[model samples]
Target chain A: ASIEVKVQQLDPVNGNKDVGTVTITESNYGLVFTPDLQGLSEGLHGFHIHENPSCEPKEQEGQLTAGLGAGGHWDPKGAKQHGYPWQDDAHLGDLPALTVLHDGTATNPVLAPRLKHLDDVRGHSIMIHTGGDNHSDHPAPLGGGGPRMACGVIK
Target chain B: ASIEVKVQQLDPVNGNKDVGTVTITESNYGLVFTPDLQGLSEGLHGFHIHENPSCEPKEQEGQLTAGLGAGGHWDPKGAKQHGYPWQDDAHLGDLPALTVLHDGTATNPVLAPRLKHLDDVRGHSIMIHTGGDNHSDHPAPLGGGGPRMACGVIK
Candidate 1:
């Protein structure tokens, strides 16, 4: 199965701004995320399948947090620790780092080997972070990636 | 201030094996981790400061989990989410990624720009994961870094 998610720049003030889309399809390796977007910083950014299916910005800590309504990572099973998708101890919603090139665009596709079916990611929100994710709790939590820059709800 | 932590390969089968050392020193950029280690896979490895100072193996899910004695990330303030060292939302113990070269040796030092106090890391354990860290929750949780391959306690 396949789906194209319309992504946008988060703007709690006047809705979200359209940046581009990410076409997700199932692959042998896992779910392939093909990002066709622009106006982003050049470098690696964080990506994930948040629990919620809405990209609405939520008020948090005196700020309008983008994609805050998506809730936590998509983990059908419960886990106390944040770990790899391949590990049983982690959140199943975790995906991989999205690579944005120097020209302020992201076109390369990243793979999530742990996912075998589309139903796992369906009805969830795809999140992109402001910074590169390291996928660890050290030095940073959630790979230390920055705030949710762009988001799209998977249908 | 600076300190040299003696690192070793975690082997619950026959106790931990000696790998080498990583010297963590304070720098204007933060904490610089200079490694002089060997006998590791040539690639990027995840680095972190676990809460506890022990590297003893603990039984979990019916197996001996290496570095299990060392608790979670060193986050004294407490948080509901995982984040990066530079970001206030993450655990303070999160560190930079570790890189091992083609020769099965790691000499290059990674930087943790968020750290300034030695007291924070003095009583914790440094852990090295089995895989390269993507630093994101996507594609993989915790940067997709694998099991704790090696560990060292900061004294």
Candidate 2:
């Protein structure tokens, strides 16, 4: 029994759009994140939890399947690797590790084990990666993060 | 002297936000992108051309510096590799490659040989990497794409 979401931030290429807000709280074992990211800027970024929740623009061509349309992090039980979302058993939307502040602002608190309920993410999509994850990839940042900066979907 | 930019597709960690419209015309060598991505669903993603224009999220948190906040893309005169954006030294924000349709919608005509105008790019940040960018890196899709599902930040 915990759900709170708000989002807005889009860019296809040079065309920018704005409106940012995120709040998801529900913890029996998973779900808790409060992000404002102000203007967004201050290091270590790589936040995930996507699979589609109608960010509108209709997922943008590319036909969804690229990264399973953001459907991997929620593990679901296939947790053998990629740990650190609170002991991890898989999915709750593997989150934790978002720090944006030089003025951008971002607060962190997460633990999602596949988001048991809360309307299962009442509309999904939440990404932010420009580099820095270290969750585990080993040396030189394999998947720790390096590209893709900013996204929002979850209404 | 041509620039009509407006794009949106957000999901930066559960914030779901969407809006699409693109136009960055400026030919002399680089800068031409047209995206109307109606619905969305096609192929090839990973476009660049970020430096700064002011999306005004508070000036974009310390200038969004992840590799110096997308500064290298508009190379001016410093070109190295990664071709097909209208060539000619390369890296001036490359340009050329961003087509989608299966109902998703996208038609990006690109070029940015060191800009020179168009608000300049407000704040800096434009990305899309799911995998598929055969520019070069030798054997192993090294340069064809691999991760970084979605991103946005270009005011």
Candidate 3:
């Protein structure tokens, strides 16, 4: 089955706004993702399925936060480390960095060969990070996604 | 890892309100669901994991609705039919019917031996239907949950 989720911008000043959409379809090769997005920085941004589907601000370590309710990257297999999306032992949520054009729009498609069904991602959140994801836990944790920039609950 | 999801009541007049909580913990038996809830109809209520985590009201067949965005029962393995939660061929979202006490409280715990991780339920919704679930499709569709009554996003 196919599923679609609307992505929204989480602005501390402006609150949440609709900015994009993520469509997931199951295919023989794997799960195909088609993302049509706008209103983001013009560069590579970390994108992945988060453990929670909430885009609401929450208290994180006593500090007000954005998208903190979405939790961390979804690693159902308990691979605690970051790696390529295709790696046999990688966070199931790992995905290629979303590239925004100079005009601040993203319209690329990605495929996760390991993903077998749409149910694997239902009831989670799609997140965009401030920094690019290297798909490796090196100088930073969780591919250095930094702060959450935008989020959308998968439904 | 342990996961907890707070269940809420979806009222047309009053909107969404917190009702109870369902916590899934890992144990030798499998994923144990501890439901601590109150303020529901005193009887058996159909409960299961839905394909989406959103409890947002949406237009269904030209009418604004409650919990329509949560989609249908989760079936990650293409098991279109419903069965016991422990059945290997059952819908992934299937769970034993939730029984509420005469005092409108549900404190019983259920187990799902097939569940292996909390992430399996992350980004989805826990739904309580107006009717009881029989864990079979013979008499009705989706265990005859009827209209959606209460729901919560698992995040």
Best by lDDT: 3
Summarize candidate 2's per-residue lDDT along B77-150 as a digit string, tens digits. Answer: 66755544434555555443454533455543333434545555545555444554544445534246443333
TM-score for the second chain in candidate 1?
A: 0.92
Q: Which candidate comes out best when scored by TM-score?
A: 1
User: By summed lDDT, which 10 consecutive residues of candidate 1 chain B come out lowest?
Assistant: B79-88
Relative to the real complex, the DockQ score for model 1 comes to: 0.02
- Best-matching candidate per DockQ: 1
Give the runs in model 1 whose Cα sits over 4 Å from its true position.
B1-155
Q: What lDDT score goes with residue A117 in model 1? A: 78
- Ten consecutive residues with minimal summed lDDT in candidate 2 chain B? B63-72
Q: Candidate 1: what lDDT?
A: 0.76
Ranking by lDDT: 3, 1, 2
Instruction: Please provide, for model 2 over A1-155, each residue's C-alpha lDDT reduced to its tens digit, 9 standing for 90 to 100.
Output: 44445544444444435536667766443355667656665555667766665343334456422223444454446564454444434344556556554455564333343354566666677777666565554664323754445666666
How many pairs collide in each candidate, listed in order?
29, 61, 3
Report per-candidate DockQ. 0.02, 0.01, 0.01
